[PDB]
Each structure stands twice: as structure tokens, then as C-alpha cells.
Amino acid sequence: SKEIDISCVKIEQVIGAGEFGEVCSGHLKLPGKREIFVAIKTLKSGYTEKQRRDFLSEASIMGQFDHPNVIHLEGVVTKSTPVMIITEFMENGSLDSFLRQNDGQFTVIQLVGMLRGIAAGMKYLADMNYVHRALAARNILVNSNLVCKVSDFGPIRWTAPEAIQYRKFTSASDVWSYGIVMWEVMSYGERPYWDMTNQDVINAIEQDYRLPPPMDCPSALHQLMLDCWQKDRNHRPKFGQIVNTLDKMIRNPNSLKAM
Ligand SMILES: Nc1ncnc2c1ncn2[C@@H]1O[C@H](COP(=O)(O)OP(=O)(O)O)[C@@H](O)[C@H]1O
Ligand SMILES: [Mg+2]
């Protein structure tokens, strides 16, 4: 969205590597507004016109959104070099790697909290008529308070049967993906279907196989997963319902006691 003048940006250091260039952290001080810490995606020089457009497309997409569970876009730098995409800063980075570094360090209530935010963000996106198509733990960022937000607006084992076979992507297929994500979270970053091959995964799902309950996962959360993994997309829950279901679990914590 908004075009930012390089004079307002002061890069601090490298915090990650994107496919289009380095990812940094830094300060943003717009005229009048108060300085803030941000994340800065840069484009490697010598880029092709296609690379430039694809890179900036990500900003155009997320720029059209605005929700606490969707990565906030501060703006972009295109008039001068390097080209940049400034966004919200998420100290804990990617959710999957984040969970791997904290194996079994959270309560069911915390995990459910993370899943609720992701659900709220997807509910928002669905209402805005946006189909992510690539929902997965690696595409969700987490901050200090553990708030998870959907990212990557620029994967067999994560995709619904129909989407894989007929390339039919809908919010419904995102619900299936959300199911896999729920598994990833309760598994603390474990890879879905483990070392199974992508083809094995396809044949397994065909044979009505479904990922088992992750360790210490309440039977109520695994059932919600199954619902998300229903062969018939029309039967899968809506993100709105997924949210309410999660909310009900928060009301009466004893509903998560049945292991
Ligand atoms: N807003 C952000 N705050 C903190 N770290 C970030 C942020 N965006 C990206 N990163 C870090 O940079 C890495 C690469 O960025 P990512 O957006 O996942 O790449 P791409 O979407 O280009 O494939 C992430 O795995 C994460 O650790
Ligand atoms: Mg990524």
C-alpha cells in the first residue's frame, strides 16, 4: 500500500532470509508519528522485472487486509533502492520452527489460544472472500504475547483432496489446511504425516486415513481436526463455527480434560 520514503527507515540487522532477498528488523519514523520497531523485507539487487513484481505483489495482497491476526503492512519502498516491504515485527518468527524450540512447553489453553487467533484471521480472510491456498504453520508468524497471525500473501500434505485433484481451492479447502495446522500446533512442529511420501499421503487419505491424535492432545481438539478433514468440503465446518467451537472450549476448560 502506502509508499514510504527511505528517509523514514533505518535498518538494524538481518533476522531471516526470504526467497526474494534478506529480511531485517529496524526502526520506522514517519513525519509526526512515533518511531516503531518493524520488519523489513528487501529485494536483492540485479532483480528481474518479474521478481520485482512478484515480490511487491505480496504487499499489494496483504495491503488490502486489516486484522489483528493478519500481518500488518506498514508500507513499501519502491522509488529508491533497495526495494522494501515494511511490516509488523514478530519476535518469535515462524510458528512451526517456534514450536519445535518449545516442545511441550505450553498449556492446552495456550495452544488453543494460538489456534483461535489463526482461526479468527482465516475467518476474517474468508469473509473478505480471500482464499489463502497455502495455510500451514510455516506461514503463520508469532509475537512475544504468542499472538499468531497469517502471513505469506505473495503443499500436498496441507491441501484438501479436491484442491489437489481438480485444483478447486475454496475457503473450504483452507479449513482442511487449517486442520493440518491444528495438528502441527498440538504436535509442536512435527511434520504432517511424518516421513510419508506425498503420494503415500494421497493414497492414505484416499483410503480414509486421518492423522492420529498428537501427544497430550484432548480428544475434543482432535475431533475438530477430523471435522476439518472431511472428504466432502460442504460438510467441513466454516471458520466462524471453528472459532465458536474453540471459544466454547475456553469457557469450560474441563471440555479439554477428555484425553
Ligand atoms: N514480520 C516479521 N517479523 C520477524 N521475522 C520475520 C518477519 N517476516 C519474516 N520473518 C523471518 O524471515 C523468514 C523468511 O520470511 P518469509 O516471509 O517466511 O519468507 P517468504 O514468504 O518470502 O518465503 C521467516 O521464516 C521469519 O523467521
Ligand atoms: Mg514462508
UniProtKB/Swiss-Prot annotation:
Q: Which part of the chain holds the cross-link Glycyl lysine isopeptide (Lys-Gly) (interchain with G-Cter in ubiquitin)?
A: 257
Per the Swiss-Prot or TrEMBL record, the active site comprises 134
Question: Where is ATP annotated to bind?
Answer: 15-23, 41
Cytoplasmic compartment residues:
2-259
Superkingdom assignment: Eukaryota
Q: Where is the Protein kinase domain?
A: 9-250
The protein here is known as EphB2/CTF2
Q: What is the organism field in this record?
A: Mus musculus
Its lineage opens with: Eukaryota, Metazoa, Chordata, Craniata, Vertebrata
